[PDB]
Write a protein that binds this ligand. Structure first.
Ligand SMILES: Nc1nc2c(ncn2[C@@H]2O[C@H](COP(=O)(O)OP(=O)(O)NP(=O)(O)O)[C@@H](O)[C@H]2O)c(=O)[nH]1
Ligand SMILES: [Mg+2]
Length: 154
């Protein structure tokens, strides 16, 4: 089965680890839980085609698709997205790389990132935007499956 090398990036504490651990282990994780592990591999079926997700929970040169994650309660994490995107562009030597913008922690009752700004940022990039919660599992499978679809269409 084809392997898809997925890389999860974004500012500190945005939920990169917790997004991946929710997908794999069906558990919302916090600081009292281990988030040391490098990579996670998981057999899935996406669009009736089996595949293996090889997920690196942050070298990036080999990655085939990237989740750029910010937290909707951390404006600086959203401002920093452009920095991660430019980093990925540099190491992949490409203006366009399979990539999904993830606004995580969408369970929280409050927020500091205007959602309309997130849609427009992603539109300027030409990439999907997905709102996720590692806590409730909202958007989690969609974020990763959407990235795989982006890679297949590259
Ligand atoms: N409410 C809420 N809290 C979340 C969500 N995702 C992560 N958190 C919380 O945010 C904190 C950071 O989570 P973590 O997964 O370690 O983020 P990280 O980006 O991997 N951090 P690091 O860059 O240091 O590895 C933890 O307390 C975690 O429980 C979410 O979707 N909703
Ligand atoms: Mg982490």
């Amino acid at each position: 089965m084809t392997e898809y090398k997925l890389v999860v990036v974004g500012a500190g504490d945005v939920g990169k680890s917790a997004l991946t651990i929710q997908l794999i282990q069906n558990h919302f994780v916090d600081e009292y839980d281990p988030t040391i592990e490098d990579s996670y591999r998981k057999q899935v079926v996406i669009d009736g085609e089996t595949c293996l997700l090889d997920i690196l929970d942050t070298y990036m040169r080999t990655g085939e698709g990237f989740l750029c994650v910010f937290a909707i309660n951390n404006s600086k994490s959203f401002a920093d997205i452009n920095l991660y995107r430019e980093q990925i562009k540099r190491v992949k030597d490409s203006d366009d790389v399979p990539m999904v913008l993830v606004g995580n922690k969408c369970d929280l009752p409050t927020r500091t990132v205007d959602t309309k700004q997130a849609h427009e940022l992603a539109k300027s990039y030409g990439i999907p935007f997905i709102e996720t919660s590692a806590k409730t599992r909202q958007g989690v499978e969609d974020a990763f499956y959407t990235l795989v679809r982006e890679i297949r269409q590259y």
